[model samples]
Target: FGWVVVFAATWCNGSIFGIHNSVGILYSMLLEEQAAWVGALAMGMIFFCSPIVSIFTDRLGCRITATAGAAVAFIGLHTSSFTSSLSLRYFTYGILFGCGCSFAFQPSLVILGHYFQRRLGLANGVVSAGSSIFSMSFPFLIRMLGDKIKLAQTFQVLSTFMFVLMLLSLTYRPLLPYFNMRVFRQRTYRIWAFGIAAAALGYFVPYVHLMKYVEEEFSEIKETWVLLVCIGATSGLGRLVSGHISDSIPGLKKIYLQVLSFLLLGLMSMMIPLCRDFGGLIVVCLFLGLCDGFFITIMAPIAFELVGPMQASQAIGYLLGMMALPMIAGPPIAGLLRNCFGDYHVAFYFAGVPPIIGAVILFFVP
Candidate 1:
């Protein structure tokens, strides 16, 4: 019974992300400055709508929320296809599709927490692993689909994937509604959320800095995509391995994993510009992915430990919503830092500083 739930949860995570990540690659390539916002708004929408999702999770069943999200998600996906106007896409793709993602995304984790609270990290690791697999394939596949057909037609095909999510929603048996904000009273949870938000300052560097830097300096044919694929592939393994360790090891705390990963991720951000060759560059990319996967897998489990499963839904909800602050501010900060410094190395290293601050904050959490 739980395994069935696990599979559905995994697909919802994957399907939502498959479209989310691809929006940047597929749309940004075709348009000017506004295209970035199309993707950005959608991403921001998911993170910002976190509390909105928990409201539905607490009031309605997880299955119904997910089903309703898929319905709207596909409609948004297809409706956005009629527009050549980038401004209109801001509403269709950004607001409509973005809202649907929030509806689906948070509940998937909530239902999984109900099913696997005892082994919560492991369950989420599996979910991240599946999501990463989808994330990896989608960008490349979306680009390929665009090559074969018109962009609007490609979107129609892309929109159809959400139908699978609608089907998977059926697998959720629906947990009895329970919700609370117990974690709000926990000092560590408050501190932890703030620290994670600080770390969000670095999250976009890998996206904004990594590929563009490699394209300029590396001077190789297969350079950019290879590293992207490596990060995606290794991150999945990172989630599975770190997740298992968090649950199986009696001596270790899940918070410790979060701290160390944040620490390592900061180090990798600083190290990015220092790696001169393509050879050492892959090493940094691999570790970055591992650290990222570790952080994500730890999030829900840490919330569960802090407030118990029911309250953790609200815990994760608001945590994600608040963290969107730094996530939104990050890339442009890096852009200006590069504009000011003239060398991207300074910007990359600057990105490293906040996560270390986050780590320093998390270390105090016991």
Candidate 2:
């Protein structure tokens, strides 16, 4: 049952993030000109809604929360397919979709934690990999669908795709549970949350800004899609490998592994601006993706370890809620620093520093 839940969780992650990541592609098909907020709204809402969704996870358990989320997402997607109104799309596609994504994505992690203890890392690795794998193919799939039919019809197809998530949500059976705001008060959990938030401060800088940087910096690199390929493919492998190593090795603290990931991550982040050629792009993206896999995959195990399995739901929930601002703020601040200083160098360097600071702070976590 636990393993089945793991399988369900994997698809749940892919559905939310993978589709969300490729949203620009969907927007291209939907409109001649895009309103950027349509996508950014969903992105922010997923994290912004985490605290409340965490409450849903606690009060109702995984099955109900996920099903309700998936249903809302289904209705949103299905309705968005019919409407040409921007206001209607904003409500259906952005706000409601984001709300559902938050509800759907959080329970997948909490439920997985409930189902496994010994090989938790392996399960998380597999689940995280689903995001990468689906993202790799999703853009092309959407494009293919558009080529085959009207773009509005493509969304209808997508609504059906979301139906699978509702079915998967039904598979989540709770092992045991508790949900509390009390987790926020403990010193250790609070420290861990802040430390992780700092790490997240720069986590998606590369993802958000890398393509533009490559376009501006290295014009000869025609195969820019390779950057996504490199990050997506390697990230999956990183998740799988890190999960195995964390579980198979005894007495190796996940925090130290997280520290190493951030250290390498910070190093690579700073190095990104220094790359004069495509070789440098490959090397930096590969390492950054790998480090990211470790950072994301190990986070849950550490959350479980820090607060115990029962409280891990709120621990992760509250932690994600806290980290939301940093994650949202990091890219824009880096972009502004680039504009201010007239170079990507200063912005990326600024991005790199916090993770190193985060690594230093994690040294004190219990």
Candidate 3:
């Protein structure tokens, strides 16, 4: 039964995160040709709507909510296939599909919270591994398909695949009703939530912009896909290793791991400008990926620790909602910096400072 839940969560995680990462490559190209905020808003909307989806799961149940989200995503992707306008794609692919992802993603975390007690961290790690594993090969796959059949056809195929995955999401069953939105009243949860929101200010900028940044700097180095692969692969390992190790440490302050991850991510963002070639960029990406994996995989376990299993869904929803403010604004602000300065280094620096500040904020967590 545990494995069954794992399988369902894996498919849901893979479909949403994999497609998001895959389209990120395409969207980065679009950013070069279009306005940067469009791309940022498109990506940012995914986090923005996550809390609404959590509310839906609380009221409607995970199976129904997930299935509905999948349907909406299928429609959004299919609609995008017919439009040439980037703005239209934002509505279809960005808002609708992103909302769909929110529906699928949060419920999986909630489901795992119910299914595992002793091994909750490991279970969350396994679930997050789905995203990493899919992200690993998706760049190559998305690139190949986009090259062979063009973006429209690629989106069409992906929508069909997503439909199948959402169908599998029907396996998840909720352990509680209402999900208790009152969990946000807790002081510790609020502090943790604030820190997460702050750290998120820079969390996604690199993923959206790194490939393009590298291409601009070292036009000779064409292995941008390799950098994406490295981030995903190493992140997968980091999730598994961190999950197991965290479980072993008695009363381990998960906040410490998260603080350290945020600090490293910030430093890496600052250092990205120093990488002169593909090799240098790859080394930076390895550390960035490891930090990213640890932080993301640890989030659910920490939420559970703070609020307990019953309130975990609501706690995470509030955290994501708070984080959405930063996630939505961060990338476009960085993009504007790039446009105004014509330098990726300034943008990278802009992306680097917030997480360190966020880490400092977390030190106050009791």
Candidate 4:
């Protein structure tokens, strides 16, 4: 059963996480060409609605919600391919696909929480590593495929992939319902909930804006997404290691998340703007991945431990359902800050502030 869960996780995670990494790639190009503002707008829609999806996951089952997300994402991808204008594609991709991915996203974490409470941190790390694995290779995959095929057709292919993967995900089942219900019954869960919200808001902004920062700050293309993916891949390894360690350690799990958040926040705010060459940028990306990757692995398991066993699944779903806020805010906030300051430095500072505070808050919480 464990092996089956692992296999199912690999396929569902690989297919979903890999493709999702390139959301910026596909959306940015389509937006720049179709409707310059729509790219940001669509991301905003997803962000705003994510919390609602969280509520749905708690009310409905994670299984049903995830399946719905995949179905919508598949349809949205194919639909976006057909539309020539930005407005309509925005509806298909932004409203439909965005909601779909939201439905699918946190439920998996909840599922992992349910399946591996005794080893929850390690399990979360391994499963979350799928995203890093996907992020690292997706650039190559998108470049190779996007070159030979029309993006419309490519998305269509991805749509088909989602459908098949959803079938595989069906094998996943919950171990217990509301097992960790008592965790939320305490005040400690508030720290986890609010901390995740703050953390989630900035999670993708760095990745989404990294390429843009490179294009603005330097003349090099080698430091493009390929470099980012390499960093993400390495960080993916961080998620795996941290997860394993978190299971063995007790209070250290929360410590890991806060430390990494501060490290990346500082890196992005101070050093990111100073990089003048590909080597420096690449180094920053690698370090950022390690620190950030550790946090991703720690959050779900930490939540599960705090909440209890049976309720861990719902707890993850409940916390993650709020992620739509970050998705919506990360980009536009970055973009606005960029416009106001005429650089990414101010934006990075703004992004870094919340996570740093989140870490500080964690120390004070339970």
Q: Write the per-residue lDDT of candidate 3 for residues 50-127, one digit (tens) a residue.
A: 777777877787778878878888888889889888779878887787777777677877888777877888988887
TM-score (all chains, Cα) for each model: 0.93, 0.95, 0.87, 0.82
Model 3 spans with C-alpha error above 4 angstroms: 24-42, 82-90, 146-152, 175-181, 219-225, 250-252, 274-281
The Cα local distance difference test for each model comes to 0.81, 0.83, 0.78, 0.67
For candidate 4, write residues 1-366 as lDDT tens digits: 755665556556666666755666665544444454455554454445545665666677667777777777788878888988767776887678766765666566666655675677777777778756655676567667766776787678778777875775676676666233454676777776776677666666776677788887776474376765666667788888888888777753555555556556545545677777777777777777777777667877776677765555556656655655675677779889999889998777776676676666666664
Rank order by lDDT, top first? 2, 1, 3, 4
Model 2 clash pairs are none
Of 3 and 4, the candidate ahead on TM-score is 3
By lDDT, the best candidate is 2
Across 1-366, the per-residue lDDT of candidate 1 in tens digits comes to 887887888888888887886766666556532555667778888889888788787777788888888778888888888878878788878898898888878888888877886677788889889888887778778878776777788778888787778778877786555345565788878998999999998877777777777777776656478888777778888999888877874432668778899889899988889997777888998999898888778887778787776677788889989887788888888888778877678888878888899999988887
Model 4 off-target regions past 4 Å?
24-60, 82-85, 177-185, 220-226, 251-268, 274-281
**lDDT winner between candidates 1 and 3:** 1
Model 3, CA-based lDDT: 0.78
Backbone collisions counted per model: 0, 0, 0, 9
Worst 10 residues of 3 by lDDT: 29-38
**Candidate that would win on TM-score:** 2
